[PDB]
Amino acid sequence: KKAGPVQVLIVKDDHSFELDETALNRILLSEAVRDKEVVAVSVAGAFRKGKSFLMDFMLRYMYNQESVDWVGDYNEPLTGFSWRGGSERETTGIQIWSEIFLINKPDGKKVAVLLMDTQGTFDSQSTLRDSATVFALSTMISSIQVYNLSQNVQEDDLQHLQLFTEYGRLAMEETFLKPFQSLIFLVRDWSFPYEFSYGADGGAKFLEKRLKVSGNQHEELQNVRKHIHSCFTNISCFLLPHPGLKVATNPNFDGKLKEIDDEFIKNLKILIPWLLSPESLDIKEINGNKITCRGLVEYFKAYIKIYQGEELPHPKSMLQATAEANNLAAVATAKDTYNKKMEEICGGDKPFLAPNDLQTKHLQLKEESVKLFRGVKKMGGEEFSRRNYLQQLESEIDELYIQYIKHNDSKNIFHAARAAALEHH
Amino acid sequence: KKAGPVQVLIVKDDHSFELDETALNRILLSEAVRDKEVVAVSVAGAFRKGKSFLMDFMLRYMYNQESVDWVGDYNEPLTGFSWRGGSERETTGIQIWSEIFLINKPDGKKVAVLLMDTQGTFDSQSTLRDSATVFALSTMISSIQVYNLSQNVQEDDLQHLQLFTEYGRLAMEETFLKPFQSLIFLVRDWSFPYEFSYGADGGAKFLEKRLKVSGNQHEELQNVRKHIHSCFTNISCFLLPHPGLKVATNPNFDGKLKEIDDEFIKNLKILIPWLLSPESLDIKEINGNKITCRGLVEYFKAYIKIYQGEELPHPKSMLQATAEANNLAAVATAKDTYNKKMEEICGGDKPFLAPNDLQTKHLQLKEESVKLFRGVKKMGGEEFSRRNYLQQLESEIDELYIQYIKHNDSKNIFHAARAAAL
Ligand SMILES: Nc1nc2c(ncn2[C@@H]2O[C@H](COP(=O)(O)OP(=O)(O)O)[C@@H](O)[C@H]2O)c(=O)[nH]1
Ligand SMILES: Nc1nc2c(ncn2[C@@H]2O[C@H](COP(=O)(O)OP(=O)(O)O)[C@@H](O)[C@H]2O)c(=O)[nH]1
Ligand code: ALF
Ligand code: ALF
Ligand SMILES: [Mg+2]
Ligand SMILES: [Mg+2]
């Protein structure tokens, strides 16, 4: 059996997740690797952006780093993880390479290298939770996360990175250390080498500016950068040239280097050993402990079990989350107002109210609190409120009303009995 | 007296917005155009994606429409709205062309055409509110919005469009009609003509598949699409080839067609008249009324005034907004828990409680509700909860306690004169 890609995290059609433990155990629990300290390299980011393609050049280096020309014969097609053109996603879930690479580090340590390829985020078959779970899991498992971006590092990219890494952090053991190790902002099709050079040095200068935290920036900009810095012990950036229009657009392209732009190739041959050379391979650490292949299986099972449950808050889009916050805040105000107004008429220090007098004032105050809730301008507007929050508000007000019923009754328990006795009299 | 770009929506370093009303009035209130029905064409989308570059080719068409060679001499630099390479944003706010084009529609109606160029969203200096205000205002003002995207239409693109259009709808008057008119998904650097042909027909098939609502689709995917369809009376899509690496990467490139990929040019010459030909020009309508240039000016002013205040909720990042929702929900659960636990000992059907016992049970139940609040897993971290919600929750529980003191005291009454009489 030849080495090949192995699907380990499956996303089902109903957006539930399954770990193929058998497949994962077969690769990571073999006698040759299971007790080896593990290096886990992942690539993640927006879909359809060359992630699998890049990983297959990483495989070439992993297999041929001892040869003079690891990058390959210029007529050799690019194989391994499945990659292709087209606007529909190819990789789903998380796949790993079936052959764990045993690599000697300069300090004599023999480490196991795992390569992890991921479903691109934001394809139109996936919920936000699907995309967040894949990104979070790949970040939580990897010791090197290659965050693959197109053309630029935009503010929505940083917000997505923040959301996905937060989602990962929420599923992890509490720790005083940073949750993750190495992040690489890999910018595909960097177009401004005259501004910042292709490679890791122009990348570092670009990203140093782009991620810099200033106490004088708007807190929204500050906090996304603070978050990202807090998550990773090392953050780097590599700017890659466009690979040429043949790579991007020719359907007959199959990965041959003779059809890839030369400056892309030069930088690819710098990028890959920079990421993967024996010196650069950071052993995976979780909660301050170096992890073996066997222990990584355990964390993969632990982490996925959390995401298969419902302990964590659901990832929400900007509009959904803001609409919910807007509605939650207005429900609280409307209910608080109903409470305070009811206290004015049937608080503990107020006289007993006849039941239909209490009912009249409750119905009026309930209506006033519903009109107040409805009047608050909220994202998603009236339709989202009515379907998801109005019934909750009216129901909770009703509950408060029944409490006030009992409070009020307590002040004159014989009201109805005495009334009936007196009506006869 | 040369036409040029005019900054009308000014964005300041403090993230405030200013309308240059003098400049806007000078352009759209002149005698020749003030009473004409207006067509407003905007381009909007992520920053650094060639929006101003595109609009400058729109300018060439708008001036040289009658000519077969409107695209220009192949040695002519591209001028108009400022465009350039570099990773840092150039256009800010909203600028318009100072010359309003007068066009005869096929039915003989003469309309005024306004061209709007916008600050790309998500640049490194902008809050989400900044980006949403620009995108929403340009959508609310334009009758044709070219949503300029790079390479593909991704689900986050649809979510951004939903957020920005929702933010626009929030500032508009209630209506029984769709709020906006024409939207064009312009996919720059479309790389898969073997899957969907370059141009409008390939774009239509591609976008139809992207925006289709299906019954078996997760409702989160359904809902963003239903929103987008509910917002626009016409949604189309154009797939544009990459312009060539020189356009993308050469710092001396200045817009000469001779340095632009011929297949890009071929589709560009189809795109611009497809967008801007007299038949294509959609007269701006707001809530079912066609708008004039003078009417459009008032809406510029009215809409920005709404965004300049705080009547509306602010757009927030996914994490910020989720953290707030998570904490608001946990606060409500904590207080609701305290309420129901207090009802078990001081509800109307419970006996009078000695004040010291009530205090002790309050203190315990408050602490339980605070522990509940703090233990609930939330986005944003424990410090966000502690700094922004914990003390208010404790204070609100303290207020509820006082209500319960009064309910409890009502159960221990003694009237000395009544007792001595009894
Ligand atoms: N524009 C561009 N295209 C690339 C690059 N690298 C690979 N491609 C092309 O991008 C497409 C998607 O590749 P793939 O690895 O399957 O993307 P993935 O979905 O992110 O894994 C293929 O057609 C590749 O030839 C790049 O750096 N820039
Ligand atoms: N890749 C690519 N670059 C383009 C395209 N159109 C223009 N450009 C380049 O994009 C860069 C930014 O253009 P500009 O109009 O200032 O972008 P804007 O910020 O969206 O207004 C310039 O270097 C243009 O030469 C396109 O279709 N594809
Ligand atoms: F679109 Al992909 F791996 F991100 F096929
Ligand atoms: F980056 Al821009 F106009 F969107 F300069
Ligand atoms: Mg892939
Ligand atoms: Mg611009």
Numbering used by the authors:
A (entry chain B): 30 to 454
B (entry chain A): 30 to 451
Direct quotes from the study:
The ATL1 protein belongs to the dynamin superfamily, members of which comprise a canonical, large GTPase (G) domain, and function in a variety of cellular pathways including vesicle fission, remodeling of organelle membranes, and immunity through antiviral activity. ATL1 is a resident ER enzyme, residing in the high-curvature tubules of the smooth ER, where it tethers and fuses tubules following GTPase-driven reaction cycles to generate and maintain the ER’s polygonal morphology. The N-terminus of ATL1 is composed of the canonical large G domain followed by a flexible linker region and middle domain, facing the cytoplasm, followed by a short, membrane-associated wedge motif with preference for high-curvature ER tubules. Having established a pronounced cellular phenotype, we set out to characterize the effect of the ATL1 N417ins mutation on the protein’s molecular mechanism. It has been established that the N-terminal soluble module of ATL1 consisting of the conserved G and middle domains, which we refer to as the catalytic core, is sufficient to carry out GTP hydrolysis and nucleotide-dependent oligomerization.
